[PDB]
Amino acid sequence: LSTSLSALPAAARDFVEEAVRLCRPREVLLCDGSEEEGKELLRGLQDDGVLHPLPKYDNCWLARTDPRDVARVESKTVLVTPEQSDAVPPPPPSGGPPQLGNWMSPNAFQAAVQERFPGCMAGRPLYVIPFSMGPPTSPLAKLGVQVTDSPYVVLSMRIMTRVGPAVLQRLDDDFVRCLHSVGRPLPLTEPLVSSWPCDPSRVLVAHIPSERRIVSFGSGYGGNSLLGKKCFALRIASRMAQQQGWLAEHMLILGVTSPSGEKRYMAAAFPSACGKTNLAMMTPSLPGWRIHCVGDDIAWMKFDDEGRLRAINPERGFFGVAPGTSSRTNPNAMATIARNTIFTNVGLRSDGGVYWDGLDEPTEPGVTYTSWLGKPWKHGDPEPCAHPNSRFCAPADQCPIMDPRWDDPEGVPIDAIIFGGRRPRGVPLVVEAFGWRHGVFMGSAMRSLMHDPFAMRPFFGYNAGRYLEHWLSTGLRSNARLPRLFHVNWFLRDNEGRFVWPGFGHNARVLAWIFGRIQGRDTARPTPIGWVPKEGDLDLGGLPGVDYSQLFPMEKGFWEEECRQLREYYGENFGADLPRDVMAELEGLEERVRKM
Ligand SMILES: [Mn+2]
């Protein structure tokens, strides 16, 4: 933290001074990403009452939020473009709520800024955060400058991105301007809740791609405030990608090594509550196989000169949902979050540790709890101890299975892309697409019952139909080594309501099959929905009782209904903006189902 801004290049300096004149902060501080700066930020945050130390652990801290500021606010998140059709398809003609993004006109956007930002930082320091999305020297990396009046945001951006000097050395006119304020100028006219400033009634999270700009007001929380995380890495980036010939995706990236020494990388898009982080840092249950984590949320991908799809993880840390995390379910995540971690809205224990539903850290008898609301809590309370969207924010380099190339500037070659879902019936354990367009259809048809195409539903940066067109166009690249495309479902249930598939480390068996398919192996049989593993070619050795026929249902009734639902979904939500090739795939599936 320094008041000297002379190291900022001209365009970055211009942006900072614009924000200063608008927001009227008490002082202006340039962040350098150093260890000493982190200690300073922590001290101020503890003094402000925002952070509780967690003396059970090594340098971990707990923040709590105002109950009105606990998650991304989709209804207040908007794309700002001169033409509405550049941002979103036509409104559902039957009058249903728009579900592929919100549009705000430039006129309306500017008027909204003018109601909110003038003088919003009075009495507060403004912090300048120069940051890189990706290793700063990667050809796939992109820079930003975020200004904010939240030390909490500064601390978390330091973890989630690359911040400081090394970024400054690369900074020119080409960066994303990221303007943030909690919207609580001093003096306060009423007490805060949990020392957490916000302006919930006026929250606005705006994306202005034509201006390389993100503007976020009134929330201090994760997806709204850490502008690299979703605003930049998916919304702004997806539009850049469409214009510049790459892909910015809501995908984990992992490396899979066979017992015989070959390594393949795979990306996977999962909607919420499908075990995304459990897959990305899985400990495999097939002897000889290794899994490494490259990232568990965002993937930026571009074809190289040889036609290989190269991916980087543009983030430097994990901002993960805490509830459910345990040594039983994810020992790698437990190791990642054991030190130098900021927890938000989890429970606090009398022994100075944390608590959330599912946590299995041994604790002494007589240990007691305080909920994320600051109230005493005991098991059986109608409310959870930790908020369901409570988070850890931890450096990625603490994950024991980080891939050796997780921060390699060249990126890793992707040979499979996996779409995920959670269905009790109908959708097989694993299916491979018959080709590129068929796979793009599978991605567009993902569910979460809600539809979540490519797991991008809340994160489109431009017309979702045109994003599907971009995916189709991408497959036409001359001499591209296109990854094979798959859809997986870990969550089929049997007649008794128990899972047919044990999941977790056994998911490695599904990755092993996919690995073999990448290798050109003759291990599949055709079905109306795509290729499935032949019985015997999916390794079920050591899984006695697991019933192959239950893992690969082929139910005509289910698919007839699924087709009806998709047709209605496409018609209402994409209309004329749906690419013909996608509709053609639905029509093909319909005809194949007719003959089954
Ligand atoms: Mn995500």
Question: What residue spans in the chain does CATH classification 3.40.449.10 cover?
Answer: 1-48+75-244
Superfamily of domain 1-48+75-244: Phosphoenolpyruvate Carboxykinase, domain 1 (3.40.449.10)
Q: 490: annotated binding-site residue?
A: yes
Q: How many Å apart are CA 494 and CA 436, to the nearest integer?
A: 32
CB 370 within 8 A of CB 376: yes
Ranges of beta strands (E only) in 388-453 are: 391-395, 412-421, 430-432
Q: What is the resolution of this structure in A?
A: 1.9
Cα 315 vs. chain centroid, distance in angstroms? Answer: 10
Q: Which DSSP helix (H) or strand (E) runs through 130?
A: strand 125-133
Strand-pair category, 252-257 with 263-269? antiparallel
DSSP 581: H
Strand-pair category, 309-312 with 299-303? antiparallel
Closest CA to 277 of 198, 331, 232, 205: 331
CB 523 within 8 A of CB 529: no
CA angle, corner 317, sides to 315 and 318, nearest 5? 105
Whether 274 is a known active-site residue: answer yes
CA angle, corner 439, sides to 433 and 441, nearest 5? 125
Question: What residue spans in the chain does CATH classification 2.170.8.10 cover?
Answer: 51-70+318-399
Selected catalytic residue, list 32, 66, 297, 403: 297
Listed in sequence order, the residues at least 6 apart from 77 whose beta carbon sits closer than 8 Å to its beta carbon are 102, 205, 206, 207, 224, 458
Largest CA distance in the chain: 72
What is the three-class DSSP state of 245?
coil
How much distance in Å is there from the Cα of 587 to the middle of ligand 1?
31
Strand-pair category, 263-269 with 290-295? unpaired
Whether 569 is a known active-site residue: answer no
Question: What residue spans in the chain does CATH classification 3.90.228.20 cover?
Answer: 246-316+402-595
Fold category of 51-70+318-399 in CATH = Phosphoenolpyruvate Carboxykinase; domain 2 (2.170.8)
Selected catalytic residue, list 221, 265, 369, 569: 221
Using CA atoms, how far residue 336 sits from 187, 257, 331, 340, 397, in Å, is 39, 22, 9, 9, 8
Residue whose entry in the numeric block shows the structure tokens 């130390």: 53
Q: Helix, strand, coil shares of the chain as percentages rounded to 5?
A: 30, 25, 45
The per-type count for the chain, helices as H runs and strands as E runs, is 15, 29
Q: How many Å apart are CA 82 and CA 87, to the nearest integer?
A: 9
Selected catalytic residue, list 52, 64, 72, 124: 72
Selected catalytic residue, list 52, 124, 184, 230: 230
Please, which residues bridge with residue 29 across strands?
127
- The residue type at 150: S
**Length of the chain measured in residues:** 596
How much distance in Å is there from the Cα of 231 to the middle of ligand 1?
11
Q: 466: annotated binding-site residue?
A: no
Burial 114-144, CB ≥16 within 10 A → b, else e: eebbeebbeebbbbbbbbbbbbbebebbbbb
Please, which residues bridge with residue 499 across strands?
493
Residue 356 tokens read as: 């959330």
Residue 68 tokens read as: 């009105």
Q: 38: annotated binding-site residue?
A: no
Using CA atoms, how far residue 85 sits from 244, 386, 389, 472, in Å, is 20, 40, 32, 19
Cα 370 vs. chain centroid, distance in angstroms? Answer: 29
Ranges of beta strands (E only) in 375-461 are: 376-377, 391-395, 412-421, 430-432
CB 552 within 8 A of CB 427: no
Q: Which DSSP helix (H) or strand (E) runs through 148?
A: strand 142-148
CATH classification for the domain delimited by 246-316+402-595, as one of 3.30.70.980, 3.90.228.20, 3.40.50.300, 3.10.20.30: 3.90.228.20
Q: Which DSSP helix (H) or strand (E) runs through 156?
A: helix 151-160
CB 484 within 8 A of CB 438: no
